[PDB]
């Protein structure tokens with residue numbers, strides 16, 4: 001209703017201001033402030049960049065929720081949709097890259113450099129483009145019934161392609177990346193078992209454990225924020241459509257929840273990363 005969507009939009013504004021502030025801070029700290037351009041932090045920079053873009057979309061989506069239609073036209077319609085998908089894919093792919101980096105650090109403790117991680121970020125945005133660009137072409141703001149709206153157009157017959165795109169996007173933007181991550185940390189367990197102050201100098205081992213913890217928590221927070229949406233959107237692809245005030249409300253709030261993940265990221269760095277913790281204040 002009117003007041004409940006006022007809640008949604010106010011939530012967006014909060015996530016928008018705090019998220020842009022935090023992620024811009026992080027990007028600044030890594031970029032110029034210090035030669036702390038480590039592999040993990042270059043990947044973190046990638047995350048903050050994607051968060052920045054989607055955060056920039058939050059005000060526009062907010063007005064759409066209020067008015068009940070899209071009053072910004074096709075250009076910004078395709079721009080927004082593109083950013084959204086780019087966000088999901090670059091996020092999961094970057095998290096996977098961080099997890100593989102951690103695993104290599106444990107297996108080969110005795111050659112990871114910012115230049116290679118920068119290259120990985122490039123490849124991440126290229127694959128993301130494989131889905132980001134087509135959706136931008138497909139997405140449009142059209143007046144199907146009663147009102148104009150921004151939507152991604154599913155080809156005819158929708159009953160076939162809907163499930164196709166639903167299952168494929170579900171697997172490849174979510175299940176498979178998370179799956180790889182699971183393999184990485186499980187293998188790290190097998191290797192780590194029975195090792196105390198092993199495969200390193202004392203001081204370094206402690207730092208490695210701290211970074212591994214950080215990556216793990218970031219993954220956990222992300223998966224926790226986007227799993228409800230992922231399941232619901234999958235169900236929507238299969239034809240399962242919400243048709244009650246409560247159903248719509250639940251959906252709106254779970255979508256919001258994922259956007260909250262965008263702003264959550266700098267706080268996690270501030271509490272679980274010593275360098276960042278020093279840099280805030």
Ligand SMILES: O=C(NCCCN1CCC(c2c(Cl)cccc2Cl)CC1)[C@H]1CCCN1Cc1ccccc1
Pocket residue numbers: 060061064070080081082084085086088089150151152169170173229230231233234255
């Ligand atoms: O409903 C909107 N935005 C909600 C976007 C939700 N987004 C939809 C795609 C979701 C996604 C993605 Cl991009 C990738 C993999 C899995 C999943 Cl579930 C992630 C959540 C309305 C508000 C203004 C125009 N329109 C934006 C829109 C953004 C992306 C796709 C379709 C519409």
